[PDB]
Amino acid sequence: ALRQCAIYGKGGIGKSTTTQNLVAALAEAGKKVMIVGCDPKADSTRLILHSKAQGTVMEMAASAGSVEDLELEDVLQIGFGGVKCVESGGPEPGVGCAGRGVITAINFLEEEGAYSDDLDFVFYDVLGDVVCGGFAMPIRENKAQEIYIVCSGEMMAMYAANNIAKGIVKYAHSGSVRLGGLICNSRKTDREDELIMALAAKIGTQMIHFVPRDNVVQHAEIRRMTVIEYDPKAGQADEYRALARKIVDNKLLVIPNPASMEELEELLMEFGIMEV
């Protein structure tokens, strides 16, 4: 019954906002969820916890002088709707591999039995600008069976989405990691929904949901909360509830067929975003 998911996409695309909000809607519906932050920015749990930034696995390990000396209560926190929160963290910029905290955190959580019997979902919020090291680990090491990619009608967001799809293809034989769909997080661009639906069709997936751009998100976040908590009656709260419901009901889990750079350019040219 436990379903392990990962939310990938380029930086600033809306992974943390989307994940925390959809998870808050899952908790609201009685689902037991854990969010594991896998982005060195380390603010993937702040809307669930109402914190400035949660102490990461790496910070606690460095403070303690060992990962082995740590216990679950050093790294795991319960927030809104009983959602469990862990933040991997990463080394300081310029030092080691930026994704090494992801490997450390996931192995620690497994060893400590953080993946309890009552848990219905686990969501990894993963940096997607590069798909290597610890960032590729949820895919490569079969940790997240359902991948959802947050993207937009921008080339860099589509390129990043297509690269994550390549990673899934590479490890398709190794486990049961599959692409569940694309989540279009609106940038208020004309034909954006059509472009992402076409990109989804081209690579053998679906655009599971279109998330509109809404200022209520900024209003909730400035108060360190999800829209679900800040204004449960807001239109945007229903958008996150619909996304959460569609992920729960999703049965389309595929080995994608990534597009070439020429094909990505062809799509953007067709939907007006690019010149010939």
Next chain:
Amino acid sequence: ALRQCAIYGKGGIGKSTTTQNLVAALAEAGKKVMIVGCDPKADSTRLILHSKAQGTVMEMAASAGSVEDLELEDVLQIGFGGVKCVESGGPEPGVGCAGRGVITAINFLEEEGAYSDDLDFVFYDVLGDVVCGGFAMPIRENKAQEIYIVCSGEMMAMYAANNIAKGIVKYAHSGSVRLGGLICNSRKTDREDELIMALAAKIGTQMIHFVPRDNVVQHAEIRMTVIEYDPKAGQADEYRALARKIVDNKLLVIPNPASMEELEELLMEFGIME
């Protein structure tokens, strides 16, 4: 006499568009300069060479089966104003280290003595979303002495800029790597220039130049630089102004990175409601 510089920033911020134009202005002023593309997107030399994509060091090494069997001739290309072009490349997504092409490329260029006697400048165009592996090598291994950052008024662009600064601090005692300044690449946001000038002041650097958002860039790219397409355009003078400012630069500091709270404080002060 050779000065080695590096241009950092988040993906899609404009790194490749800025670099190929400031270097073009250096070449037209008689400077001998080489661009080493350190981004897996591998379209960092695309415009100066007037190509769709230059054959990367990784592709050529993979094609040859070894770096030892690789030649300088089929990795280095001369484009506009005699500018030398090298594209590092990277492995396939999900595989190895995304920055591996950078280590391979820089070590190959050194061994082949691509850093010739006549060369005045070397500009590394580095991916800045992560500061590790090959992307941190020009800083960590003292390859580029002058660092510069293309950013915008967006949180993720400023956050990226601040981490590059942290990387410079970490290796300040290991070599002579320093921060030269910030380059604001306009997203047509009100008070965006003030925000980047403030971020620069906060971390002990300068906003060396403000690059406006211009459609002439798209007109040139549809596959050459602005200085090649329309040297008389207003935008061509913008990059010329930047080039003058990097040679005339001596403000190369050990930065004082801001906290996340300080980055938020800056955005809250200048940033405007959508």
